Amino acid sequence: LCPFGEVFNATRFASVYAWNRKRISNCVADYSVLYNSASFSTFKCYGVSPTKLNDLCFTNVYADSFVIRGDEVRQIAPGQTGKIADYNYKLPDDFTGCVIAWNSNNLDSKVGGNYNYLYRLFRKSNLKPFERDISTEIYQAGSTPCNGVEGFNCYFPLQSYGFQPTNGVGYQPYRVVVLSFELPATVCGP
Amino acid sequence: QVQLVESGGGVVQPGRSLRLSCAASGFTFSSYDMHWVRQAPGKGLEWVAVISYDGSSKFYAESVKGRFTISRDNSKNTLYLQMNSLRAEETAVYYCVKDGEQLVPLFDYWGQGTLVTVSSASTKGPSVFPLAPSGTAALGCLVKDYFPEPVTVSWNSGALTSGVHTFPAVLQSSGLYSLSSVVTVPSSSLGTQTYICNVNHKPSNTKVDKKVEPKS
Amino acid sequence: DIQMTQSPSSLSASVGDRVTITCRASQSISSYLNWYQQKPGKAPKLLIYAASSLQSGVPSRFSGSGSGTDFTLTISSLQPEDFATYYCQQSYSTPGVTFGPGTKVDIKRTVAAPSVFIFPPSDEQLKSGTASVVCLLNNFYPREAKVQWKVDNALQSGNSQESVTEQDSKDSTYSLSSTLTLSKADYEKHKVYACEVTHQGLSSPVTKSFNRGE
Ligand SMILES: *[C@@H]1O[C@H](CO)[C@@H](O[C@@H]2O[C@H](CO)[C@@H](O)[C@H](O)[C@H]2NC(C)=O)[C@H](O)[C@H]1NC(C)=O
């Protein structure tokens, strides 16, 4: 088999700015284990209909995973813009693959508030498709240089998510996994 | 000779449920994803749900997710779509559709559809009022305030047919339907000739007749 | 979310015409684009799939082209049973599938001004407690015409509703009925009712009017 279990049921996830990638090759991709879970709040596929997945042959499988807040999940698709789609994780315009996400205030929300999960708020330019950027350059939001010192018009680029268990339907933590495909083949389901 | 036949339509009250059904023949129903696409009365097309060739996966348009459940039975070669907690704005024709052998959905064979009318409006027969005239003239009847649809309107029990325009119905604020049918006639005839429109509404067992005569 | 827009939403053509309908996608959908034909009261029937390749049983005078965000459907030589409404449909995002709004193609013919008639409410209707004023535009071409209700030289908006017929089989014209739906009590408060019609085949507008009473 292909190790979807290690991807989805994984106990910890990355902050969206440092999204994690796993290559998948030389195994059998069993989507029936995903279909059955009606716990997934998102499940869209691009280039292919999600019903035809156990019936297909995939070339360059990757499985990207990270955590964002709910009303940001819509930025996980081709052709979006917003803080996430521009400064954190940017899908290409011809993306072929599946985007799956599910509410997880049960595991990533802590009494009082969980600040481990971060996102980049500023960046001098937009991410390229599938670019990962973990730098902590102070952001020069002003006209005078910063010299690596925080202050007015000099901002730390990464910010924290405030995940209180008491958060709104849209301010809760979501776990996202992005299956990137291509259509020799090393991954095929039943 | 591919064929699909929807069933189970009708009028349903907002909140309550209704279950639709499609009986399919003329191809191997075994291996072809099936969809439901709907068409709002005077509007365009909206995909609703898909179920895979065996039933393992079901997916919904995000506007009906969690209310509609789709399903199938490969021994009965029939397809189902249970609609729960229906809203008034969801009145439309529902088509079942056979997918077409592509990686992504495409809508290969459609079939003719079942109408679903969602409204709390009680059954009512139409009131009919004349529109009277005074070269070539025009006159008509206004068929107003009725539910459900249809009504049918003829003129002179069918003697007059050329020059009639019975218009599409309009769903008015009331929740009731309203309509008018007009006729254009030589003017010279308005004096001697008699013009009488008949209206007929089978779902209320009303056959009403009105005579349209010039005023003053 | 991916939105499809088509142009033009109306099209008049004669038999023997090169016809071109364009679809446009809010973003690159590659070439997962399908075209449908629908005639009034019938179901939609598939013409073109995957942007460019043709359905079986479909005549070869249909063709679709383009990819990315701009696509075309072409009837290289129009034929008489092609008068219908045409839709496109992106199937890239598949748990989010979307259609065009549709382009209707009708029969082009010699222009014909409408015959305007106005109907004050009936004697019998006012007895019940509501009054309805009907403005009838009769046997015109093209489909595209403007109807303004003026009551005491004051434009009305938002209590008029209208219906229009399909293009007629024999003469290829339209007819329209604007219905101003009111109340008997409110009908009293005004004395001059009118319905002004603008159309292409009218050199200047035509108003038809009545006085409540007289
Ligand atoms: C995540 O873990 C759960 C629990 O082990 C897995 O769910 C089981 O799946 C099998 C087959 O689908 C069922 O027969 C069990 O009853 C399920 N148990 C529970 C508690 O749900 C699930 O498959 C795992 N998901 C992934 C992606 O690996």
Side-chain angles (χ1 to χ4, degrees):
Chain A
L1 284 177
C2 296
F4 297 155
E6 279 159 39
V7 173
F8 290 89
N9 280 326
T11 52
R12 298 205 80 234
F13 281 179
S15 289
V16 63
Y17 84 102
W19 51 275
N20 199 258
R21 172 162 281 201
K22 186 176 283 187
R23 187 192 175 210
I24 285 177
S25 75
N26 299 323
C27 57
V28 164
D30 186 27
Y31 295 102
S32 74
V33 175
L34 285 173
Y35 294 151
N36 294 20
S37 53
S39 51
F40 284 147
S41 79
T42 302
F43 190 83
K44 283 199 179 175
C45 294
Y46 301 75
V48 56
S49 168
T51 62
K52 296 180 178 68
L53 277 182
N54 275 352
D55 296 328
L56 272 192
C57 274
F58 302 97
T59 303
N60 215 349
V61 181
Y62 295 107
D64 294 328
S65 89
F66 47 87
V67 163
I68 56 190
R69 70 185 172 107
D71 47 2
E72 285 170 342
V73 181
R74 37 172 306 279
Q75 306 182 34
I76 316 296
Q80 295 291 313
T81 71
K83 306 296 178 171
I84 312 296
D86 296 327
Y87 296 165
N88 289 314
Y89 181 83
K90 173 81 176 189
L91 291 173
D93 292 333
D94 67 347
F95 181 69
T96 305
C98 295
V99 173
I100 318 174
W102 68 94
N103 179 297
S104 81
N105 196 71
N106 64 34
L107 322 157
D108 298 322
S109 177
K110 298 305 194 299
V111 190
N114 183 354
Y115 293 75
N116 302 354
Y117 290 101
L118 302 172
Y119 68 92
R120 185 177 306 275
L121 179 51
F122 306 105
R123 193 172 190 275
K124 301 172 302 176
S125 54
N126 274 3
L127 281 183
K128 299 222 292 289
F130 284 131
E131 185 175 347
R132 180 181 177 185
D133 175 20
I134 63 182
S135 69
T136 53
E137 296 291 327
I138 306 300
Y139 177 64
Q140 184 186 350
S143 62
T144 65
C146 290
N147 258 326
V149 301
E150 202 179 4
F152 179 74
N153 290 140
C154 291
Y155 301 101
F156 195 59
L158 305 168
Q159 165 95 0
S160 184
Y161 283 135
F163 290 151
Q164 315 167 10
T166 178
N167 287 151
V169 289
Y171 273 65
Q172 276 175 23
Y174 275 69
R175 303 196 163 206
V176 187
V177 173
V178 190
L179 299 170
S180 303
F181 317 140
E182 184 69 25
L183 301 175
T186 70
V187 180
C188 299
Chain B
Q1 199 209 354
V2 180
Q3 201 180 357
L4 293 88
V5 177
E6 299 91 345
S7 63
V11 186
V12 64
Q13 201 167 5
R16 289 286 184 164
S17 64
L18 172 54
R19 191 197 184 206
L20 288 194
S21 315
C22 170
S25 70
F27 68 99
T28 87
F29 184 82
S30 62
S31 53
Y32 277 123
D33 307 78
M34 300 289 294
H35 318 265
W36 283 100
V37 190
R38 72 178 166 195
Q39 189 166 32
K43 294 167 162 306
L45 295 166
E46 176 178 4
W47 170 77
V48 180
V50 61
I51 190 161
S52 60
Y53 61 83
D54 53 17
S56 60
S57 54
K58 312 188 284 186
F59 297 95
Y60 304 124
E62 199 157 1
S63 60
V64 309
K65 196 172 266 278
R67 291 191 297 129
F68 293 3
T69 70
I70 183 177
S71 61
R72 67 193 287 174
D73 190 331
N74 277 0
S75 60
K76 293 179 180 296
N77 280 29
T78 57
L79 187 76
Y80 309 87
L81 172 73
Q82 169 87 30
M83 308 191 292
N84 291 27
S85 179
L86 288 86
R87 288 77 171 267
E89 73 268 20
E90 303 192 23
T91 59
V93 179
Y94 287 66
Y95 309 74
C96 63
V97 185
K98 152 196 180 297
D99 190 306
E101 282 172 348
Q102 293 295 302
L103 295 85
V104 286
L106 72 83
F107 306 123
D108 189 81
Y109 192 97
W110 283 64
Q112 289 310 302
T114 185
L115 185 73
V116 174
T117 304
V118 185
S119 192
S120 67
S122 305
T123 313
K124 180 171 181 304
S127 314
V128 186
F129 309 107
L131 307 176
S134 68
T136 50
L139 71 164
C141 300
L142 165 70
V143 192
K144 195 167 169 300
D145 300 333
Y146 71 86
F147 180 88
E149 189 175 4
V151 289
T152 67
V153 172
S154 185
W155 280 80
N156 287 2
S157 295
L160 184 61
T161 65
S162 58
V164 181
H165 293 312
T166 304
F167 287 94
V170 307
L171 190 57
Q172 56 190 357
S173 49
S174 65
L176 300 179
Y177 292 87
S178 173
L179 174 140
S180 52
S181 185
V182 309
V183 180
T184 180
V185 294
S187 175
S188 104
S189 57
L190 294 173
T192 66
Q193 197 55 47
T194 287
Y195 299 97
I196 184 168
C197 82
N198 54 21
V199 171
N200 190 357
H201 184 204
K202 280 257 199 287
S204 54
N205 287 328
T206 300
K207 299 183 178 185
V208 158
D209 290 357
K210 174 53 54 65
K211 199 214 191 279
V212 186
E213 25 195 5
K215 10 197 223 133
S216 278
Chain C
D1 189 0
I2 313 175
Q3 155 165 334
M4 323 290 305
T5 95
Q6 310 192 221
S7 158
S9 63
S10 180
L11 192 47
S12 305
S14 297
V15 180
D17 273 352
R18 188 271 318 269
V19 180
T20 300
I21 306 183
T22 289
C23 185
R24 191 177 183 272
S26 76
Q27 57 180 267
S28 168
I29 62 170
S30 177
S31 76
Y32 310 123
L33 181 66
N34 311 319
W35 288 96
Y36 299 82
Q37 181 200 73
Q38 194 184 32
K39 289 175 174 176
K42 294 299 175 181
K45 295 186 177 174
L46 171 57
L47 303 185
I48 310 294
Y49 70 98
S52 61
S53 63
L54 185 70
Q55 187 58 43
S56 292
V58 184
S60 51
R61 62 180 181 273
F62 293 93
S63 56
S65 304
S67 61
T69 63
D70 300 343
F71 306 81
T72 294
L73 161 67
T74 310
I75 304 175
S76 54
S77 186
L78 190 62
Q79 309 277 6
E81 73 279 19
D82 290 341
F83 293 93
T85 306
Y86 293 78
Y87 297 93
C88 61
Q89 175 258 328
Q90 73 89 8
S91 55
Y92 173 67
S93 175
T94 58
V97 188
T98 44
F99 296 83
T103 287
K104 191 191 177 192
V105 188
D106 63 354
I107 320 173
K108 186 200 287 171
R109 57 143 289 165
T110 64
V111 69
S115 304
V116 193
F117 303 104
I118 186 164
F119 295 107
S122 58
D123 291 345
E124 191 167 348
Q125 191 185 178
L126 285 156
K127 295 185 184 303
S128 59
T130 65
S132 301
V133 184
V134 175
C135 190
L136 167 74
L137 278 65
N138 203 13
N139 296 340
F140 62 84
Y141 183 83
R143 152 78 188 84
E144 180 184 354
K146 200 183 68 174
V147 169
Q148 288 197 334
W149 289 99
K150 283 175 180 178
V151 177
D152 283 326
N153 302 91
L155 268 169
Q156 294 293 313
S157 302
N159 46 5
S160 57
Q161 297 181 108
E162 64 183 40
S163 299
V164 58
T165 63
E166 299 274 358
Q167 199 178 17
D168 193 76
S169 305
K170 307 306 164 179
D171 59 17
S172 299
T173 66
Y174 297 94
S175 293
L176 181 148
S177 81
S178 176
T179 312
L180 179 65
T181 303
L182 291 182
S183 73
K184 173 184 173 175
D186 198 12
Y187 178 77
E188 307 259 358
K189 293 175 176 172
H190 313 292
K191 182 179 169 184
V192 179
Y193 292 89
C195 72
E196 180 176 343
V197 168
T198 312
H199 189 258
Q200 174 178 349
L202 286 182
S203 45
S204 58
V206 169
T207 307
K208 293 281 184 171
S209 60
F210 79 88
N211 293 317
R212 169 184 60 77
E214 283 78 343

